[PDB]
C-alpha cells in the first residue's frame, strides 16, 4: 500500500499531526497504513483510528443529508443535478465504509485479545454497516441491517459478560445499538428499553469511578438521556 515504505511509529506520529492540523483524510490514511503493519493497536491508537474515519464519514453523511433534503423538497411534481450529486456523495461514503469494514475484517477483529478491544472493533463494524444502511435500499439494505445487528449483538454479549456497566466502550456501544434500533430497524420500543437500562445501570455505579473515568462515562450517559428525552 501507499504507506508500505513508512515505519509504523512514523505513521502514528503523522496521524497525531494530521489530527492537530484537522486533516482527517490524511489522519485516516496514516492510521490505515499503521493497521496494515499487522500489529495490534493500543487503546490510544484505536481512538486515533476511530476519530480519523468518524470525521471523514461524518462530513460525507452531513453532505448526503443536505443533498437528500434538497432532493426530497424537489420531488413534489426539476433536472437530474441534485440526484446525480447526491449519488456521487453516496458512492464516496460507501467507499469509506467499505475501507473501514475491510480493515476490521482483514486486520482488527480477532477471536483473541482483551474484551475491550474486541467490543471496540465489533462496535465499529456495527457503526459502519449502520452508515451503509442509512443510504441503502431494497435487498442490499436488508443484508446490511442483518450485518449491523449481528456485529452489535456480538459486541453487546461480550460487553455484558466482561465489562462493568460504566465502561465507556460498553456505554458507547449501547448508545449506538439503541440508535440502530430506533432509526434503522424501526424498533423504537427496543431502542428506548436499551437506552433506559444502560442509563439506569450506569447511574447505580457512578460513585465507584475515578475523576477521568467519571467524565468519560457521564458524557455518554448524557447522550443516552438526550435520546430518551427525544424518543419519549
Amino acid at each position: 500500500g501507499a504507506m508500505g515504505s513508512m515505519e509504523r511509529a512514523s505513521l502514528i506520529q503523522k496521524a497525531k499531526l494530521a489530527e492537530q492540523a484537522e486533516r482527517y483524510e490524511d489522519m485516516a490514511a496514516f492510521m490505515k497504513g499503521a493497521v496494515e503493519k499487522g500489529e495490534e493497536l493500543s487503546c490510544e491508537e484505536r481512538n486515533l483510528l476511530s476519530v480519523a474515519y468518524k470525521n471523514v464519514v461524518g462530513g460525507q453523511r452531513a453532505a448526503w443529508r443536505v443533498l437528500s433534503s434538497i432532493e426530497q423538497k424537489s420531488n413534489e411534481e426539476k433536472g437530474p443535478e441534485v440526484r446525480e450529486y447526491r449519488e456521487k456523495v453516496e458512492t464516496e461514503l460507501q467507499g469509506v465504509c467499505d475501507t473501514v469494514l475491510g480493515l476490521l475484517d482483514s486486520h482488527l477483529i480477532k477471536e483473541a485479545g482483551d474484551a475491550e478491544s474486541r467490543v471496540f472493533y465489533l462496535k465499529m463494524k456495527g457503526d459502519y454497516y449502520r452508515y451503509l444502511a442509512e443510504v441503502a435500499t431494497g435487498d442490499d439494505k436488508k443484508r446490511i441491517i442483518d450485518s449491523a445487528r449481528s456485529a452489535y449483538q456480538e459486541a453487546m454479549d461480550i460487553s455484558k459478560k466482561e465489562m462493568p456497566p460504566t465502561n465507556p466502550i460498553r456505554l458507547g456501544l449501547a448508545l449506538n445499538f439503541s440508535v440502530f434500533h430506533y432509526e434503522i430497524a424501526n424498533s423504537p420500543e427496543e431502542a428506548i428499553s436499551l437506552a433506559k437500562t444502560t442509563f439506569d445501570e450506569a447511574m447505580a455505579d457512578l460513585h465507584t469511578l475515578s475523576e477521568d473515568s467519571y467524565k468519560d462515562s457521564t458524557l455518554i450517559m448524557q447522550l443516552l438521556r438526550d435520546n430518551l428525552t427525544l424518543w419519549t
Binding site: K196, M203, T218, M221, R225, L228
Partner: peptide, 7 residues
C-alpha cells in the same frame, strides 16, 4: 455533577 435521573 451527574446527569438528571429519568422521569
Amino acid at each position: 455533577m451527574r446527569p438528571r435521573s429519568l422521569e
